[PDB]
Scaffold this active site. Structure first.
Site, PDB file in Angstrom:
ATOM      1  N   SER B 110       0.940  -1.385   0.016  1.00  0.00           N
ATOM      2  CA  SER B 110      -0.060   0.043   0.073  1.00  0.00           C
ATOM      3  C   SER B 110       0.678   1.184  -0.134  1.00  0.00           C
ATOM      4  O   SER B 110       0.523   2.057  -0.554  1.00  0.00           O
ATOM      5  CB  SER B 110      -0.836   0.175   1.199  1.00  0.00           C
ATOM      6  OG  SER B 110      -0.229   0.179   2.203  1.00  0.00           O
ATOM      7  N   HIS B 163       1.343   4.998   4.087  1.00  0.00           N
ATOM      8  CA  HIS B 163       0.216   5.740   3.159  1.00  0.00           C
ATOM      9  C   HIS B 163       0.566   7.016   3.125  1.00  0.00           C
ATOM     10  O   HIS B 163       0.806   7.395   1.740  1.00  0.00           O
ATOM     11  CB  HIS B 163      -1.252   5.663   3.906  1.00  0.00           C
ATOM     12  CG  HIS B 163      -1.749   4.071   4.083  1.00  0.00           C
ATOM     13  ND1 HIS B 163      -3.046   3.930   4.709  1.00  0.00           N
ATOM     14  CD2 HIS B 163      -1.093   2.886   3.591  1.00  0.00           C
ATOM     15  CE1 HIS B 163      -2.831   2.697   4.818  1.00  0.00           C
ATOM     16  NE2 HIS B 163      -2.211   2.124   4.182  1.00  0.00           N
TER      17      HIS B 163
END
EC number: 3.4.21.105
Lengths: 4, 181
Positions: B110, B163
């Site tokens: 991610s 992230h």
């Protein structure tokens, strides 16, 4: 655990 | 979509994940995680191999989905090299920041994915001629996704540093890339  | 680097990455994540199901999560983690011990700091692969680890079918499928969709576009429109560089910088930087946020026990693609999200959107915005873009219809979900990790959505422990760091990094690369040519 941590999920990216 | 049919790009080599796209598929080589999907293949590695699936290999590693299967390895995690045979050996167990923790046993793969001791070798692939970011260095938990500065003694281990010269095991260089760990700065990148954390991106390969996933902890649920949902984790991996959701990541590979985005990766295929976004990684594919960059590979096709911009070459395999641009993709690799994006993948290596963001796996290195988002690992780095995530370790600072909550330590070395994390993994998943991610970090690279928000970097691709950041990149495709900023690049489609400033350099339309580059033939890539991100639906506002997705940068929402992106924004919800990131902020939902802030609230640990229904017990889901998300790598919040990964992230944002990844996202930031993609935006920097796309902005820089949208000044040349």
């Amino acid at each position: 655990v941590r999920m990216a | 979509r049919a790009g080599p680097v796209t598929w080589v990455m999907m293949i590695a994540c699936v290999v590693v994940f299967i390895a995690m199901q045979i050996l167990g999560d923790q046993e793969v983690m001791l070798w692939l995680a970011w260095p938990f011990d500065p003694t281990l700091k010269f095991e260089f692969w760990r700065y990148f191999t954390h991106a390969l680890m996933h902890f649920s079918l949902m984790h991996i499928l959701f990541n590979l989905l985005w990766w295929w969709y976004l990684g594919g576009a960059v590979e096709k429109r911009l070459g395999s090299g641009k993709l690799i560089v994006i993948t290596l910088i963001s796996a290195l930087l988002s690992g780095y920041v995530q370790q600072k946020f909550s330590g070395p026990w994390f993994g998943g693609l991610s970090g690279v994915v928000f970097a691709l999200m950041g990149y495709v959107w900023l690049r489609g915005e400033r350099d339309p001629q580059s033939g890539i873009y991100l639906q506002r219809g997705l940068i929402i979900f992106a924004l919800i996704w990131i902020v939902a990790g802030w609230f640990d959505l229904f017990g889901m422990s998300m790598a919040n540093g990964a992230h944002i760091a990844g996202l930031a990094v993609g935006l920097a690369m796309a902005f820089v890339d949208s000044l040349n040519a």
